[model samples]
Target chain A: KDEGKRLQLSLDKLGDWEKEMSQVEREAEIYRIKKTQPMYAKRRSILKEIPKFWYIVLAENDDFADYISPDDLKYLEYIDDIYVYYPIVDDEAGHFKDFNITVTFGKNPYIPEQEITKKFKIVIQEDGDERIVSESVEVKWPHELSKINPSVIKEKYKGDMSAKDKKNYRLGMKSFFSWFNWTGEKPGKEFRNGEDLATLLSEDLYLNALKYYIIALSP
Target chain B: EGKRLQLSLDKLGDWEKEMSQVEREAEIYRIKKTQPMYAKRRSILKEIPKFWYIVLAENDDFADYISPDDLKYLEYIDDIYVYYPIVDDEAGHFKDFNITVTFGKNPYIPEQEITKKFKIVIQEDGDERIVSESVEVKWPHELSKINPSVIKEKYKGKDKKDMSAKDKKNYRLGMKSFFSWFNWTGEKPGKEFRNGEDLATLLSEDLYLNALKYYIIALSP
Candidate 1:
């Protein structure tokens, strides 16, 4: 009986030791996986500018009353222009009688060719000896400028205006201006302008001058 | 013979006791080395709020220039505001500088305190009318708050020394089990196998498998 008890105790002790060793081994494995795994370091760039823009709308007349419609308000664009439709009283007085709009374009380092403008109209109607008034305000292409300069195209076409085979390249200039309006930069000035400057100048010197003027203002 | 048997029994008991002590000491050492460092870090890092201030300029026609799609993106920020400054300076006076609307925070006034905790500034050109703008962002905690030592100190030596032997054993087992989870292996079944292995190792392996299964299920779902 004593021998049996001794044997059981020995087995129990060995079992316990085996268990402890297994536990330690498992723990070590986990630690290895967690501590040694290749983990990517996450970082936020401090130099990045958190971009932001604002839109303000002011409506003053029945013609511009549509501005109050939530759906119409949803169509606003740009970061600097404020929209306003002021109500008119007679031919002289209006809702924004004491107010004048000021548009400020923030420092946008990314935009190359920038133009800012606002479009609104005052409608006058003759009422016997007095004049009736209506104000219609619409934000049509506010603050827009050609994005590309003529130098960019001169470099791109390499002074070879004849290569394009056009007598008056005014359309090409307009096309370039429109293209620049969207792209905000000239298209391969080194290649287009450098190769075709002579031909482009021959086709339209005035347009070429305008292109240079646009390039000078790009940020 | 009986006396000899008793002596042998006493020797064996002494051996068992000594083995238990040694096993416990080994376990304590392992646990100290293997615990996670991020949970404590996270608790410390998420305690503060960050703030950002954005300003926009009004165009000459007082028309909307920013599109609605862009506005939606801006709203995703934690907090945001928009302001338009109108100028009546066709008469060549500073009286033209007036703000029409303020969206996220208080409007910029000439002589008033703009924000209790923040400030406002206007950027302009030679025309002196409101022609430009600025933005600001503030974060409460620096990125260095991600270390584990910060967490360890929070619970440093609180209840470790006074624990009973059994409790210490249990703790050691739990730690071992938690660690075993990193290994890709099937668990040994049955109480015989369970009791024979360190509890820590068993728990760790089982938990790892369980976690993987959860991911697999989530992917399919």
Candidate 2:
């Protein structure tokens, strides 16, 4: 079991510690949402991410790390080195975005690389006159299951796409399907007919069901 | 009940801030209405909507009025020595990366062409969307160009009890950051950062860039 656990911190109220820190302070962080899930079903791994940045407060030393989150000490580690992914994807905006974090212990030998992803939701509160509301971040996660009309992919299937999307989506679909077949080591034969592919497939139980099935195979 | 006159003044101040805000809102919307393609890649980062002076965390200082759990908006990374900062332009308290930050242009606005470097991330279009926000602030030098405040009360803390330690920490980090560049604009911290009086060591100079990033964010508004 060389697997490592990941921790996440929110930047909404990031802390500031002035003390100079040596290479001794260590800590870990996690999510409130994951904690709410039943223990046996909880996600044990994560990515290093912050809401905007700074959710994972860096400190000068150990006592300094002590002041981060008293109740969340179990999550916050006082480590000497940590790596977190920043920049809201195309901007997480006033919505939640997930970023990656990784903790690796090379020479230290006591720890393993704990890779993680933290989700942060920046909300636009109703108080610009009172509070510091973010610029309502609204990231339209690219149609994962297909928000486009199923007929559209079909139309493209019939070569009815714009020169722009035609070039883009053509290579895109070709790459995706071939890569898919490559990964599976065999063609899914059913996809041989472009007719079987439709935007509606996303609306159906197919995509979502496949998601769980994939996760189920992880263990 | 609050005083009617007090309410009137509060309303008046609100309108002043509101009018400026409206102007800013109108600007963004007008950009959207006028230029569509740019509406996505181009933008003007405003400022810390609230808590102007706090450097990193909520609990670091001014915990009295500021909530303690709101960690996501402008957060400070722990242990890595990421020191972004702001002065007590009014003697206030704390609040909350990397890569190049710079002056975004589309309107040919009055901003320096300084491309401040920060850090990175990916875009939805599968592009490497810029992670570092190059917040251009011509306003930093122009604060109170009309008569803001020279009281430096932000480092003094008028509302809370004892904000000196936290305030000083934030302030020193910011001052030293400015001193690094304002001192001479010499490529790196050079001679200035190496010998400045207090915490200005070659070692601290390396730490100063983090504080510099923090300063630029505070400059927004």
Candidate 3:
């Protein structure tokens, strides 16, 4: 019973301490953003020196590269740049760790969109279970190249396709381009390693693009 | 089966090369860029009273590690700084980061500060781990909440074998104090006592890195 009372007292004191900390915290955040702004701007200019920066970054990563089929590399080679930024309006505003990945493509045959932007939101439910909710934009592929979509692979191998044709169709489904259509909205419609791909791109692959760029420079 | 296992390990070795390269690049950014900014921020944070205290209390996982009884000691904290090793190497990058918890004139502990130098070994054929070095912090008197006798007296007898299974869990849970954490000798007595390396990593990497964000969140409108 004393322990209960002691805990209550501790919480009450902590509450008071937090009230005192508010203005200081607000000012600290202002300065933090102020510091980061220029560093990011400087990095953007420096990135222009390297060609096919994002392509090598994705290609060198075994986790991400495994999803990229030989045919997928044809489109992937055109990836000029990729950068991650948090969708924060204000220092105190926006969901924690919610970010947007902007992937820029050069004149590519497969995707009509010059730049593909995907937003990944970290959703914390009322019951305290945390999950990632991603909003993906459609990559308008021309009707001639509809096979770039993993969905078409099913149609291509629908009935009595040859064994060689089935093998090719199965391999085509592994394309990283399929990630462009993964909305994570349909819970039942399974995309192979969809959730894992979202996290890898948003959290790891994009953040450490320079690291992979260094490895790609190697033989 | 043996050939399959060998093949799996061969694939892993290739993946490990990429992982190592990632660490190497991250270390370059840390030493050349990240650390300098964090150091400057740490100095600026000193202007705010009880900044580190609030930051430490802000984290859900970290906050639970603190006993309600030990929250008072946090008020005495002057500063908390985490230092990464200056030398950038494959072997040294994963190890030798240190955390120093500085205390102002405190009644309980005699030392002005406690610094833990951690070394994590990555075994070739086994798991990477850290039981860590145990430094004996001699508490001046009987004020230590984690004192063996104090805990025993708090429950009942010296032996908790006499208690019920549920009560046994409680007796173990009661030892969740910062002082007990400070006195940790890399021993996992029960499920309640977490791996010191895990707690230390969180404190340095997560809690210390995002201190300002957490401090801002803790405030009520």
Candidate 4:
């Protein structure tokens, strides 16, 4: 009887501890967001004065640069600013885990929109584990920029190049634009590493833009 | 060029201040919310036998450091209490912590408990890393399999034949036993661990914080 009681008590205690830990983490995240909001506002205003801020900042990060192609850089150079926003939810009931990343561009030839925003939401599965759900987007590429598409480039060449030439072409064929259309439902061969690249953007590069901006300023 | 550097430095200084402020507030929040609940949880765990041992054993990453000899000794270990800094002007804050491991009367050593303190420090122009103070352990004889000296001396030219093939392999694995970890001083890691900082983090942060998760694992199967 004592054994059964002890087991039940331990389970109850562990469950309570887990619940308390979640609450603590949520409170901490809320506090962090509250404290850091002003800093981000200042950062955005300062970034507005700088020329090609995000373009240089994105290019400076080696991991982020892997997704950037020569043609992508041409369009990215027109990007004025990048912002990672965590929406304000009811501190007691709503989730603080969700966020949106907004990339603002000036007049650019590749797209007609002034900005593109991607939202990530946390969906707790039946097993109680959380998964990230990213917003799917469609990029309307101009006819001249259609050559930058990975599939189009492969079809256009169509075995005209030798093995060495094909290898070089494949190596230089990355396009950051394709990352927009990735729905996280079923990524093709091109978007196989889509989640990882998006994680890099949302988690590191966008959040630490200033650190990379300083690197971009360096010799 | 000069203007950008000036602007970046000023903004960076302000950002650093804000970052530190956020961390300080978060630590206070954590201490206030979690401390009392953890104390109650610790009391509940006291009723469970071989609780901490099972928790450590269930973690594959931490279990890699335990040997057969270490396992037998760890069975006597009943408690692992972790102490975080009290949030007060007099207290040292959250960057430092202590872990006290308590053992029931065992044949290995006389001391009932060993408490080790650790500090997280940021070196000039370097990242923040953890440092630990070594605990003094008195080994009456270096004859125990948990003793590094005994393990090393056994493998020497003529002395290796006394052990069975299975026991020999077990002793070889015992070189990285948890018992040897007490001697680590955060300066130079013993041959057992490749990195001292990683070992310190494993014991103080990972194992201590995730003890309950591992306890759930221990109870499952």
Scored by DockQ, the top model is: 4
Clashes by residue pair, model 3: none
Note the B-chain TM-score for every model: 0.24, 0.18, 0.68, 0.71
TM-score of 4: 0.73
lDDT comparison, 1 vs 4, better candidate: 4
Count clashing residue pairs in model 1: 72
Q: How well does each candidate superpose onto the true structure, as a TM-score?
A: 0.15, 0.16, 0.47, 0.73
Q: Whose lDDT is greatest here?
A: 4
lDDT of 2 by residue, A80-166 (tens): 233433233245333322323233322223223343222222334466322111111212112332323222455656735566655
Residue B198, model 1: lDDT of: 31
lDDT by residue for model 3 over B1-221, one digit each (tens)? Answer: 45654554455455546556554554444454445555665565665567778877767788766667667667767778887775444445445677888777767655567877777676677876665565545543434533543556666754557655655554454456565566554545553345566788788888887776787687656
B1-221, model 1: which lDDT tens digit per residue?
45654554455456446545444444443444332221222222122111111111111111132222223223222222111111211222211221111123212211221111111233354332122111112211221122122333544686645655655554444323311121212233331112222322222233222322332343353
Candidate 4 Cα errors over 4 Å, as ranges: A1-4, A68-70, A89-94, A107-113, A134-143, A146-175, A178-195, A216-219, B1-5, B57-68, B86-93, B105-111, B134-183, B187-197, B216-221
Docking class of 4: acceptable
Model 2, residue A95: distance off in Å is: 4.9
Arranged by TM-score with the best first, the candidates are 4, 3, 2, 1
Interface RMSD of each: 29.7, 24.6, 13.7, 2.5
Compute DockQ for each candidate against the true complex. Answer: 0.01, 0.01, 0.04, 0.31
TM-score of chain A of 1: 0.20
Arranged by DockQ, best first: 4, 3, 1, 2
